């Protein structure tokens, strides 16, 4: 399937406390593999995967250097952004950044992207062309001009098209046993008489990987996205996720409702009934 | 392609591999697509001895990447003071201007590298150099909160 190397960086001005908090997390697909925290004692990128720990010290040194370059850069960004927006120091603001390269089943360069957010709002994004910028506002317009002059897009292109893919392929060779997996959701029905008249059937899915799953209701040929509540997919912390959906249904229904499931783990779907 | 191996080695820091590759005849000034040089990689990595072995190999001290950054720029931003000094002794252009108009002095000021600031000033860096925005290093210091550097630059004007 498609695979992603995803890097998330966030920075928060902490006025008076005197240093911004900086968190960096890298993911390969849905598996957190590296981290950084300004407030951790290590001051180093730290392995979160048994594969990544095979990576030797030269790399951890280099990633420490690069993540501290991210830290200083995001610091000065914080200050420049609060310059562009003309807002007083006396309050916390946040910067966050996210970039990565996606590959298809052949592991060729599928797609790269880069994004930037100030104060939780979208600020700048690399267009899929990797050559032009979607500015959000006159401040982001300013940064667009500066990055155009600096040719930042050529840098980003060279990275996202090049080393990103190389590293991603290596990690997938090393995560041969943990990122290549798929775990098919286990599922169960539950029945509750939520009132003297009304009941609910609730269909559970859990212990599946990757997170992408769909569950839906039908009255055997009619749409039941009506009397239905749904929750976001959630992590078990086993390195796996959970979700459930329910239908508000009359008691004593003649097994008319059914839970339909689709997940990449199921070569034959496993729809099942009360 | 010896240049790719030399670039990688300077990125990885195999100082012995650096020396052997230079001996084999790798282009010291080999250029990447983005025009970054082994000198830029060595500045970034803080590989002092690799820096010196490249410079003795006649590395173009003032080579500009596609962003217009010189190795001096990289060193200044990242704080690799000994590299800064070795570059300057090698003849690095203290006033070299990138495509944005930033000097290394700009970067040192905005990143708060006071020691490097002082070395640059002793090397003839222009305190008054204005970027494309018109911003002096003093401004960038203030904006970054490096008040002591800000006042050093304003006093050194």
């Amino acid at each position: 399937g498609s695979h992603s190397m995803r890097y998330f960086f966030t920075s928060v001005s902490r006025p008076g406390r005197g240093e911004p908090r900086f968190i960096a997390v890298g993911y390969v697909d849905d598996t957190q593999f590296v981290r950084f925290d300004s407030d951790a004692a290590s001051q180093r990128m730290e392995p979160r995967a048994p594969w990544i720990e095979q990576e030797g010290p030269e790399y951890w040194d280099g990633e420490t250097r690069k993540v501290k370059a991210h830290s200083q850069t995001h610091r000065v960004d914080l200050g420049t952004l609060r310059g562009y927006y003309n807002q007083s120091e006396a309050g916390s603001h946040t910067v966050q950044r996210m970039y990565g390269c996606d590959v298809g089943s052949d592991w060729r360069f599928l797609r790269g992207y880069h994004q930037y957010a100030y104060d939780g709002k979208d600020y700048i994004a690399l267009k899929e062309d990797l050559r032009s910028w979607t500015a959000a506002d006159m401040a982001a317009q300013t940064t667009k001009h500066k990055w155009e002059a600096a040719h930042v897009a050529e840098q980003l292109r060279a990275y996202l098209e090049g080393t990103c893919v190389e590293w991603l392929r290596r990690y997938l060779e090393n995560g041969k046993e943990t990122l290549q997996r798929t775990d098919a959701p286990k599922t169960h029905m539950t029945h509750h008489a939520v009132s003297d008249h009304e009941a609910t059937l609730r269909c559970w899915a859990l212990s599946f990987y990757p997170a992408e799953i769909t569950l839906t209701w039908q009255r055997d040929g009619e749409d039941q996205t009506q009397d239905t509540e749904l929750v976001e997919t959630r992590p078990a912390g086993d390195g796996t996720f959970q979700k459930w959906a329910a239908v508000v249904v009359p008691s004593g229904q003649e097994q008319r409702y059914t839970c339909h499931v689709q997940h990449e783990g199921l070569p034959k779907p496993l729809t099942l009934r009360w | 392609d010896l240049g790719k191996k030399l670039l990688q080695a300077a990125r990885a820091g195999q100082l012995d591999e650096v020396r052997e590759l230079l001996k084999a005849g790798a282009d010291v000034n080999a250029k990447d697509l983005i025009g970054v040089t082994p000198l830029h990689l060595a500045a970034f990595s803080g590989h002092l001895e690799i820096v010196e072995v490249l410079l003795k190999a006649s590395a173009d001290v003032n080579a500009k990447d596609v962003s217009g950054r010189t190795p001096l720029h990289v060193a200044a931003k990242h704080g690799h003071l000994e590299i800064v000094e070795v570059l300057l002794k090698a003849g690095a252009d203290v006033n070299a201007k990138d495509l944005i108009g930033f000097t290394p002095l700009h970067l040192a000021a905005q990143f708060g590298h006071l020691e490097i600031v002082e070395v640059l000033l002793k090397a003839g860096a222009d305190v008054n150099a204005q970027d494309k925005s018109g911003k002096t290093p003093a401004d960038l210091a203030a904006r970054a909160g490096h008040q002591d550097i800000a006042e050093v630059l304003q006093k050194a004007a």
């Binding site: 990633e63 690069k66 370059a69 991210h70 420049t80 600096a150 840098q155 990275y159 | 990125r11």
Partner: peptide, 9 residues
């Protein structure tokens, strides 16, 4: 690997 040459905003 992170991006080696991030630019300031």
């Amino acid at each position: 690997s992170l991006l080696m040459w991030i630019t300031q905003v």
